[PDB]
Amino acid sequence: VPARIICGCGNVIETYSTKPEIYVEVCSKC
Amino acid sequence: ARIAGVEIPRNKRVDVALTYIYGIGKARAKEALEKTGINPATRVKDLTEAEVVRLREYVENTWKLEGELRAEVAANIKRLMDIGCYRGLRHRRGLPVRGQRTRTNARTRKGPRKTVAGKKKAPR
Amino acid sequence: PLDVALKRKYYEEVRPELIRRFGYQNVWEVPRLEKVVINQGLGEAKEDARILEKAAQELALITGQKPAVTRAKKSISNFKLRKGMPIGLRVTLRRDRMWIFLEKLLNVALPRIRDFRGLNPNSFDGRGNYNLGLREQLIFPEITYDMVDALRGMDIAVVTTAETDEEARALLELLGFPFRK
Amino acid sequence: GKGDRRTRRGKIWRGTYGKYRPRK
Amino acid sequence: SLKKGVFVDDHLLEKVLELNAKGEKRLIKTWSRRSTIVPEMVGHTIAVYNGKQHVPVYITENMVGHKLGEFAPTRTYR
RNA sequence: UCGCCUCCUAAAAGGUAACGGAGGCGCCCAAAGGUCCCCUCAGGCGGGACGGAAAUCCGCCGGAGAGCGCAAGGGUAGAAG
RNA sequence: UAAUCGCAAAAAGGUGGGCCCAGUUCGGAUUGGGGUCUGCAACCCGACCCCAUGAAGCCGGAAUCGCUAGUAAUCGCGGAUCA
């Protein structure tokens, strides 16, 4: 299902996965 | 609560929890808690998502820190394989590098006792 | 959805760049991902009476497909177990699902690898297509530190139209693969 | 304890002063 | 840990400085194992004494703060 | 040594002796059987976290040297696998 | 030129705060990085102070030492030698 990733680097990415609830400790912006 | 890479403390008072990082001890801990202005008596259990980010901001950005800290010291011991200083050896023979008595202890740098012996005295 | 970022990126960005770099005449000559087959080895699970069906139902969250339950073809006393009831865990991703997986992997997962300086640039070798292997499976978003118990790595093969690894290297680097120059 | 050089008792037993045992 | 000064021998620096005068060769005996390796004095191989012999040791930039005796170990097979 | 099976001896049909050369059998499978429908090997060279020199994964090259419970021979992937 | 000033703080204790049975805030070896001081000179080889390391040890096999009262245990202090 469609998902919403949330970085500690502010950035929000729009992929699709299992469960949209996503806490990221920094993506590839860092 | 994964501040440094593979490292995650939890349900303990944060002050000493942060100890559970390579590159962070009681000192660099307290130092950071006033600067983030957070009560250390509080647990990793409980805190704002803001508190968390505020803490990992200050820490991970300032100094280093498992991985490339660990990898750094090694390259320094490596460089003592120049033409070969005194501290270069001792690292080469796994012996005390810091001017000590090998004749007896040293067991911390030498794996437990290789008793290996077969000495003799008088039969007849 | 039938469209994702990378998928778009490929067409409206990378597709052309490559046509400009290497001068292809036909749309099809332009290299494209074929598939990304991902696999776990699992030397245990055999023994300690280990059902270990923990890995597939877990893997399914990250990859989005129920993985397939692969088994040993010889008997090796030396390295244990005897052909059959044996172990290994493999899933094949094409189209959207392929894309969604790479999207996340590159944009998120490789970020929280323990060390990292870039992906090894010696894992095509002419033989088009690229392999790499991982250690921790919790580096993905869907996996949580609560969920784990043992840290099972995996191998990722990604297969392409490119006949040389020159033109395949470009494709991956431009899709957003950080290589250890 | 009586050798943790980062402590009250550590400095005491050694008989020196520092951060972890302030000189007056 | 000399922190104001470099405890480094006279007979040495005068010797490398009048060899710096147009930068000639290098065959240099010494017993100043007690002294620090000076910046740029690279190339110049110094035969340092260790109680028995003058060991012919070569020099480079990465090594600097180290003493010359720190490249003439004194005992044999550990 | 004594019955049975494979090969050679056996002189291009069959058959062919010797205390000639050299091996197997006295079991096994409720699926290792019937039919229908799918699938194709051993190696070799890359490439890939734990991983050997073949554990599982990817890619090329590979008409058969794989495999077909067990000895040998025959046969066999356009399947007997 | 010293019961007239200094080493100097005795420590355990007492008060109230923190850890919650964890190889841990137990334990401080090993090692890296950074400094101070004595000395002509701390590479072999000094002791300190700080940042980072946090090793073996969950009370010790056969053995075996000391002590009968201000003792045994346990805590800290001075002095000789001497930069």
Side-chain angles (χ1 to χ4, degrees), chain C residues 35 39 70 72-73 78-79 123 127 131 134 153 155 159:
Chain C
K35 53 186 182 133
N39 152 279
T70 227
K73 273 163 257 185
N78 221 136
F79 274 97
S123 297
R127 322 271 61 160
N131 301 251
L134 305 183
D155 295 286
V159 181

Side-chain angles (χ1 to χ4, degrees), chain A residues 7-28:
Chain A
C7 301
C9 41
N11 198 181
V12 180
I13 311 105
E14 232 132 301
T15 84
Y16 328 97
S17 86
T18 52
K19 73 189 161 187
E21 256 275 324
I22 296 296
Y23 308 59
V24 173
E25 330 107 38
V26 150
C27 67
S28 28

Side-chain angles (χ1 to χ4, degrees), chain B residues 27-38:
Chain B
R28 296 183 170 192
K30 296 271 162 154
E31 204 250 43
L33 290 154
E34 64 184 71
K35 303 316 303 306
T36 48
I38 322 179

Side-chain angles (χ1 to χ4, degrees), chain C residues 44-53 81 85 87:
Chain C
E44 69 296 56
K46 56 172 188 223
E47 196 260 304
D48 201 274
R50 280 294 66 208
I51 54 166
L52 241 311
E53 299 140 20
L81 252 186
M85 288 181 88
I87 276 102

